[PDB]
Every structure is written in C-alpha cells, then in structure tokens.
C-alpha cells in the first residue's frame, strides 16, 4: 500500500490495479569457464643442462 | 454528433445513444460537450404466434406494414414494434400468388368491407 | 514495455549514475509506452463486448433452411472456434523488453463472437436496441428485403433460391481463404521496428567500443566517463525514436478500431443504408468472426441481375 | 554471471540437445544473442536463458475500504518469487485467494483473471464477459412489446485544449 | 525523398566512415519517407477509382 501511495504521489489511493515495481531474480557468484593449457615452457632444460 | 444527432433524427444504430433515437439535446463542458440522448426503449414483450401469409379464396395475402399474429384462437396484424391488433381485411394486406408457394401459409378468413356494407 | 534503465546502461553501475544526470527522460518514455498498452484493451473492449448476455442458439439448428454451420462454434475443440475462424487463425527475454499478455483471451473473444452471431440469427436486429425479441429468420430475411426495396413476396416465393445461393456464396468463401496481408503488415512492422532497437546496441556511436565493459576495462574514471556519455546519447536517441513511432503508429491503430467499432454497431447490430459502408449492393446483413489481432466481417448484400429494357 | 574463454555473460545454464559442428564453439539467435556455448574442457552444450525480471503490481481495494493488499509478480514463476500463492497466465499472485464462482470484473489482472474485495483481502478469478440470455427461439413464434420507456443518456467529447 | 548520407555528408568518404558509427538512422529515415510515399498513392486510389 505504501509503495502505491508512493507510485502515484497520494495519500489516498482509489480503487483500481497499479504497477508497482518491479521483481528480478538475483546472481550469486561468477562462474569463468575456459580451455585447457597449452605446452609448457622446456624451462627443464636449460636449467638442467 | 451535433449534426446529426441534435439538427437531425439518425437511424444509425448505436450513435446516438442505446435503443432508438428520438432527440438529442447540447450541453457546454470546460473543454468540451455534453450530448443528452432521448431514446425509445421497447419494453414487456409477450409471444404469439406468426405466419408469413394468410390463404383466403385460393389466394395469398401479406400485410402491408405489419405482421400476422395469433392469440391462440384468432388472426390480427398488428404493428411489429408495439401490441395493437386489427382485423385482417383487404385494406391492410395485399394478394401476390396462390396459397402452396408459400412455406407457412395459414387457412384464415379476410374481411371485405364494401361486402357487407353495401349490402 | 522498456526498461529505459536497462536498455541504457544495463548492469553497470557507472552509467546509472551518469544517466541519473539527465531528469526525468526515462520516466516519461515509460509512461508513453504504458498509455498504449491501456490503449489497446479498450480497443478490443469497444470492438467485441457490445452485447449485454451471452446469447446461444438452439439445439434443433434449422432456420427454416439456411446454412450457419460453417460460421457458427465448434464443440469439438478447446477455443470453441468455428471453422472459418480456424483457418483465419492458421494464416497469420531481452535487454529490458518485455511483452504482456492481452487481458482478454482469444477465447473470450470468440464466446462474444458467437454470441453476437446468435442474437443476430435469432432476433434480427431487436437485440441491439433492447431485449432480444426471437422471430423466424424467414420472416426476418422479409422485414430485409423491404429495407432495401423489394416487395417481400419476393422473398417468400424465391425462399429456396435464396437460400441455395447463400450457402454457395458462404462455401467459396472458405476456398477463397484456404488477404490477411492487412493483419500481417502490423506484426511484421512491429517485429521489425523491435529488432532495430536491439541492433542498435552493437554501436559505439563515436566511442572506443560499444560494451560497457571493455570501455572501462581498459581506462580510468576521468577517461571512461567521456565515452560513455557518448553511449548514453546514442542509446537514448535510440529509445526516443522508437517510442515516437510507436506513438505514432498506435493513433493509426486506433482509428481502424474505431471504424471497426462502427461497423459492428451499424452492419451487425442492424440494417444500413449507407452506400457502401457494408460492401458492393444493397446491405442484407452482415457476421463477425474473429482474427489474430483484428475483426473480418461478412457481409451479405443484394445485387441485381438480368435486366430488360423498358 | 559467466566467463567461457572470453564470452562474457550472464543467466541460467541448461543442458542442450542441439549438436553444434565440431568447430563451432557458440551459437547466436536471430537478432544475434548469444544462447548456446559449447563448455572447452568437456565440449558439451549448454543454452543460455536470461534470469528472471518482472513487473511488480499491487492490488488495492481502496484505502477508504481497507488496507489488505495483493501482489502481481509479472510473468514470474511462482517458485522464484522470494498463504495464498497463485499462478496465472499473468503471473504469481500473492495475497488472494481462488474461488470457483465467477460474475463480472472489478479489477482486471488478466487473460480473464479479475480480483474483488468480497470474501475481504483481495481476490483472483477472471470477470466472465455478461450474464445469460436464451431465446425461445421457434420456426413459428414471435415476441411483440406492449410497452416503452423514454430513457435519456449522456455522453462526454473533448472538444479543445490549452493554448501555450 | 531524401538520400540520408547525401545530405549529411555530400560526396565525402572521411564523413561516410564516421556516419556509420550510429547504426541504422539513414535506413530508418529511408524507410519511413518510402512508406509515406506509397500511402499517397493509395489515397487518391481510394478517393477516384
Ligand atoms: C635434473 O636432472 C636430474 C638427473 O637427470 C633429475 O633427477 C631425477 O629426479 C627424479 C625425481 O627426484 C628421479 O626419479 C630421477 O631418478 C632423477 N634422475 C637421475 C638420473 O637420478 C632432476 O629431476 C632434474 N631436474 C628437474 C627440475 O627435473
Ligand atoms: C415465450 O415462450 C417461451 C416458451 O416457453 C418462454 O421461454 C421458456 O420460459 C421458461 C420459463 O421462463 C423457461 O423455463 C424455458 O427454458 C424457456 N424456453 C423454452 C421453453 O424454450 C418465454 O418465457 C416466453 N416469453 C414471454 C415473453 O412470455
Ligand atoms: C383472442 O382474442 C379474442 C378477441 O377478439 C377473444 O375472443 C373474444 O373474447 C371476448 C371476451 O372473452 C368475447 O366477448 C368475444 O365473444 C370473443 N370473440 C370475439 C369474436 O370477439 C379470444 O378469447 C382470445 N383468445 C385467447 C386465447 O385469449
Ligand atoms: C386450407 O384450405 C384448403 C381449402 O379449403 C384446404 O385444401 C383442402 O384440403 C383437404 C384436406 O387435405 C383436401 O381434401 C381438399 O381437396 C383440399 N382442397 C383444395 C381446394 O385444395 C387445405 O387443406 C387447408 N389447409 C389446412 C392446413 O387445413
Ligand atoms: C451445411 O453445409 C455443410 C457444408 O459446408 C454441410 O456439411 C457437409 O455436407 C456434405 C453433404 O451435404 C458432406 O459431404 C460433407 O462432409 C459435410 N461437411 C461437414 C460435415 O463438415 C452441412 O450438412 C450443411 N448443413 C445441413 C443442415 O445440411
Ligand atoms: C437495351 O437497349 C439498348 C439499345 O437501345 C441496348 O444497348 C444497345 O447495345 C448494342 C449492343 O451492345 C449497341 O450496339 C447499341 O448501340 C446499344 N443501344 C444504344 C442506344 O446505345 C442495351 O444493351 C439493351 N439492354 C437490354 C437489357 O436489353
Ligand atoms: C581438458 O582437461 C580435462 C582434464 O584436466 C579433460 O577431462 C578429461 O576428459 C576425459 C573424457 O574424454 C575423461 O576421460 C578424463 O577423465 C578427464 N580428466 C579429468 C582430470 O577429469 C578434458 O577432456 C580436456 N579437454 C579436452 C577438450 O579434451
Ligand atoms: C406501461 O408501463 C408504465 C410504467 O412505465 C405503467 O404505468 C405505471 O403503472 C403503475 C401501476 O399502475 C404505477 O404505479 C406507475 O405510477 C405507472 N408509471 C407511470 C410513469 O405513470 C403502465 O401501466 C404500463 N401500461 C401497460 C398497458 O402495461
Ligand atoms: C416447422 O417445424 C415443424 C417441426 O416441429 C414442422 O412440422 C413444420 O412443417 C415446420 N414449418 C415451417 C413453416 O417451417
Ligand atoms: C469513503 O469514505 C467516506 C467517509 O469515510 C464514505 O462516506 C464513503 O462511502 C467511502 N467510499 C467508499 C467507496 O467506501
Ligand atoms: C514453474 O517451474 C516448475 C518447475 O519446473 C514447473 O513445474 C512449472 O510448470 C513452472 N510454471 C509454469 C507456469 O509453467
Ligand atoms: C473448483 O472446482 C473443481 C472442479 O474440477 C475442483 O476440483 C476444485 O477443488 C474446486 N476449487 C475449490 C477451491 O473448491
């Protein structure tokens, strides 16, 4: 009742149906998907040489 | 609306105003008009009985500007939009045809004024 | 319905503070498109609910002869349609966009359609000015010939005649139906004006990109703040523009219901004699059905043939 | 709120049943969004459909009749809104409840659903569309009136707005 | 009608590149001078034949 009142800037509201607001689910956490890894460097040997 | 509704009668359905037009009358308003429709409404309606055509002499009559009702005994031809029985004569029906054309017809007896009368 | 906010910015948080900026525009697009969303209830409300009972025909089915079969509803279905108005019905989530549903179902519109037609059927023209006063339909296809002129033993002596050649003239209509392009027009316009709003989101309008993310992704405040002004005043004069139009159209909409509402009262509800407000000759009567979106009107007419010279 | 390999969105994730070619690591719709990805590390596909957002409506009676009030979500369902919990072609209705009787409109929700302060709170149960008339109709019978009524009607135009 | 690009640019590339930053406005503009274009024939169809 309060946010109707509110909607239509009155305190006395007649009778009828009156858009309100509005409902939105909501998100919890982000999922980041990606590929594989490629090669990895031969780091191996150059230091093991 | 002003036209047609307040200079005229208008035999347009549904246009000024809801059954059948008789009058209207202006009213001014802040930013506009106020139309007051006068209307006839038909009201308390009983059944009868009809027939298209009545078979008399071999030939077929039709009403004039009526229609053929039956109280459950008798035949009159009344006017179609308000309960007023006459006697069915020669003066409010016409003849086209003979009686087996027509779908409907009914026996019945139509009155000729000059017969009795002159005799 | 838009959501002004959301088409706009959408998500992020930096362009609602900057949109905050500009008044009252999206506040005033949301109430323009919420006054022709009203608008088109009271447009079917006008077209179809013109009668006060729901009226029904009965059982026995025989008008003296007359043929309604093909326009009058079908038991065996769910809507209830007849089979003129199934083959009319058989012919025709987002960045803020959202479509409601008509308060009206089509199912009620068909139950005013037939009940229209049965008052029509049963009654003549004595429904729409009061109580519905039944008569034979025989009788009243007379009461019509007189309106337009003709001597009503012409109508009882031709009765067969006359009925066979209605029934024929209501059978090419189905084989010239199995046209709507006035039907389709609207919802290809439609359709089409709602997908260049939603394209126009894949432009930069002069900034580095066109996703809101990116922009800032790669950029401080005081830089990023430039460009995304300029998205906003892109995407804005997007939403103008296809509320305008809408506005527009809709005003085109409304008067084609307001005809519509005229022909029903003055074609269906009764006899006219207004020179082709009815169709090509002398006005007998006229049946709705109804469409996707709109009213088709049948009418019956009188025309003659076979002169000789005199 | 999702991230496969540079695609960045958000919505729910369902399994698919479309079969991309095996080259083809997303799928666009008509009017070009995104909604379907194909998953890099099991390569699977999975469609993508927007969360949920709706309209929110309240039902009033009058606040000179009552303060009880009735909630529309638009076109939500009813399992996703957070008594009398109601769905409808229009949406979950909260705070009325269904009756078998129907008479009239009072206050439209839609797709012949209506609600009424009657039995109050508010309510939800279409509006029908007028009462029931059967006429006696017959090969050979007529209905004539006997009386009339004069009655008299009015109707309002907008003629003229202010000049500025 | 009016040729959108032409009025705005008038025979210049560097003005036709930056015009094609704000989408579909010519083809909207096109679009609706066309089709009040084809009304008017319609009009007088409907007024004379
Ligand atoms: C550098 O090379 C040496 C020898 O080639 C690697 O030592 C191996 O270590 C693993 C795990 O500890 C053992 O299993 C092998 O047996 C070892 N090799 C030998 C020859 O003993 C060492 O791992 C290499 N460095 C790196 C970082 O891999
Ligand atoms: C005209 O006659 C008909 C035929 O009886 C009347 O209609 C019936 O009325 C009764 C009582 O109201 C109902 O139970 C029936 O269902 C009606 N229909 C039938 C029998 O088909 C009607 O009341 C009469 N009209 C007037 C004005 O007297
Ligand atoms: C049908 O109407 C006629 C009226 O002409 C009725 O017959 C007359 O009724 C009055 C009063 O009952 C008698 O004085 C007359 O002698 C009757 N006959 C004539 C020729 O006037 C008749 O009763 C009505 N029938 C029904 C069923 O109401
Ligand atoms: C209406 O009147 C005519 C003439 O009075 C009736 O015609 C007679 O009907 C009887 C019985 O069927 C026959 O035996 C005669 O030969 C018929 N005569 C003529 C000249 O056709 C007619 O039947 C009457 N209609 C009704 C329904 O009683
Ligand atoms: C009303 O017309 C329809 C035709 O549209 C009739 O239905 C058809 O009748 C023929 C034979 O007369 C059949 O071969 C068709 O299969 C029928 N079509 C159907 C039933 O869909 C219907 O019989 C007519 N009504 C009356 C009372 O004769
Ligand atoms: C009525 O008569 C007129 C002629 O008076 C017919 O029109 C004639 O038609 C022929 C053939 O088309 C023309 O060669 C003549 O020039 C016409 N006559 C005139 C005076 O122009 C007309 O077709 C006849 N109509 C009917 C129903 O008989
Ligand atoms: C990316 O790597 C994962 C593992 O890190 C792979 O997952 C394997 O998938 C096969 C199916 O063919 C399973 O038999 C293995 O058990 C999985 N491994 C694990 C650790 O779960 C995945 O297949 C790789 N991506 C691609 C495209 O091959
Ligand atoms: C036609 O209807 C009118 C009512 O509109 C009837 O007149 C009423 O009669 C009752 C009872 O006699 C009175 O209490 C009312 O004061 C009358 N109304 C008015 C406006 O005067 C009239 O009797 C009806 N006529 C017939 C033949 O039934
Ligand atoms: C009317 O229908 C009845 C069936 O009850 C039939 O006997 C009669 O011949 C029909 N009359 C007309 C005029 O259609
Ligand atoms: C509104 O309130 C006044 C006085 O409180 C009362 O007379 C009136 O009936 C009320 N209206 C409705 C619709 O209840
Ligand atoms: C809401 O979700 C449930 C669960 O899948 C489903 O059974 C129901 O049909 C959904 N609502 C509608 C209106 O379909
Ligand atoms: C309404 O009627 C139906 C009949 O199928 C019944 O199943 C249902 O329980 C009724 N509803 C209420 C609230 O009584």
Same mark, same amino acid.
């Given at each position: ?49 | ?37 006068? /209307? ?37 031809? /009344? ?29 019945? /007896? ?10 | ?37 009203? +608008? ?116 009882? +002596? ?93 005003? +085109? ?58 | ?164």
């Amino acid at each position: 009742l309060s946010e109707t009142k509110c909607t239509l800037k009155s305190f006395t509201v007649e009778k009828g149906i009156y858009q309100t607001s509005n409902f939105r689910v909501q998100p919890t956490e982000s999922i980041v998907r990606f590929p594989n890894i490629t090669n990895l460097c031969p780091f191996h040997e150059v230091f093991n040489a | 609306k002003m036209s047609e509704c307040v200079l005229g009668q208008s035999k347009r359905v549904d246009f000024c105003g809801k059954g059948y037009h008789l009058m209207s009358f202006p009213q001014s308003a802040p930013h506009g008009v106020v139309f007051l429709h006068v /209307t006839y409404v038909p009201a308390q309606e009983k059944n009868f009985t009809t027939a298209p055509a009545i078979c008399h002499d071999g030939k077929a009559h039709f009403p004039r500007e009526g229609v053929f009702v039956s109280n459950g005994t008798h035949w009159f031809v /009344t006017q179609r939009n308000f309960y007023e029985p006459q006697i069915i004569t020669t003066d409010n029906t016409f003849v086209s045809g003979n009686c087996d054309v027509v779908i409907g017809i009914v026996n019945n /007896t139509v009155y000729d004024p000059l017969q009795p009368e002159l005799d | 319905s838009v959501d002004c906010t959301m088409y706009i910015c959408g998500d992020s948080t930096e362009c609602s503070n900057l949109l905050l900026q500009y008044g009252s525009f999206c506040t005033q697009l949301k109430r323009a498109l919420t006054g022709i969303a009203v +608008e088109q209830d009271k447009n079917t409300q006008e077209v179809f609910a013109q009668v006060k009972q729901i009226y029904k025909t009965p059982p026995i089915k025989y008008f003296g002869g007359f043929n309604f079969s093909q326009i009058l509803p079908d038991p065996s279905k769910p809507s209830k349609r007849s089979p003129i108005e199934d083959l009319l019905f058989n012919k025709v989530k987002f960045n803020g966009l959202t479509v409601l549903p008509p308060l009206l179902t089509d199912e009620m519109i068909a139950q005013y359609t037939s009940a229209l037609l049965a008052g029509t059927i049963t009654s003549g023209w004595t429904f729409g000015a009061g109580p519905a006063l039944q008569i034979p339909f025989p009788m009243q296809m007379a009461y019509r010939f007189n309106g337009i002129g003709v001597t009503q033993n012409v109508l009882y +002596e031709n009765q067969k005649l006359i009925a066979n050649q209605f029934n024929s003239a209501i059978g090419k209509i189905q084989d010239s139906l199995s046209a709507l392009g006035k039907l389709q027009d609207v919802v290809n316009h439609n359709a089409q004006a709602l997908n260049t709003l939603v394209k126009q989101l894949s432009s930069k309008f002069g900034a580095i990109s066109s996703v809101l993310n990116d922009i800032l992704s790669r950029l401080d405040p005081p830089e990023a703040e430039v460009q995304i002004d300029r998205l906003i005043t892109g995407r804005l004069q997007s939403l103008q523009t296809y509320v305008t139009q809408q506005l527009i159209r809709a005003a +085109e909409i409304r008067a084609s219901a307001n005809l519509a509402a005229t022909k029903m009262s003055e074609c269906v509800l009764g006899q006219s004699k207004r020179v082709d407000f009815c169709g090509k000759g002398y006005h007998l009567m006229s049946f709705p059905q109804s469409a996707p979106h709109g009213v088709v009107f049948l009418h019956v007419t009188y025309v003659p043939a076979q002169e000789k010279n005199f | 709120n999702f991230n496969f390999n540079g695609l960045t969105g958000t919505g729910v994730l369902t399994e698919s049943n479309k079969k991309f070619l095996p080259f083809q690591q997303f799928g666009r719709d008509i009017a070009d969004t995104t909604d379907a990805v194909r998953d890099p590390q099991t390569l699977e596909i999975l469609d993508i459909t927007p969360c949920s957002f709706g309209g929110v409506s309240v039902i009033t009676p009058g606040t000179n009749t009552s303060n009880q009030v009735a909630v529309l979500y638009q076109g939500v369902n009813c399992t996703e809104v957070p008594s009398n919990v109601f769905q409808t072609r229009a949406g979950c209705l909260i705070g009325a409840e269904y009756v078998n009787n129907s008479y009239e409109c009072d206050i439209p929700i839609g797709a012949g659903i209506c609600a009424s302060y009657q039995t109050q709170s508010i309510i939800a149960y279409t509006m029908s569309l007028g009462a029931e008339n059967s006429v006696a109709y017959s090969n050979n019978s007529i209905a004539i009136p006997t009386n009339f009524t004069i009655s008299v009607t009015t109707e309002i135009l907008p003629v003229s707005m202010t000049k500025t």
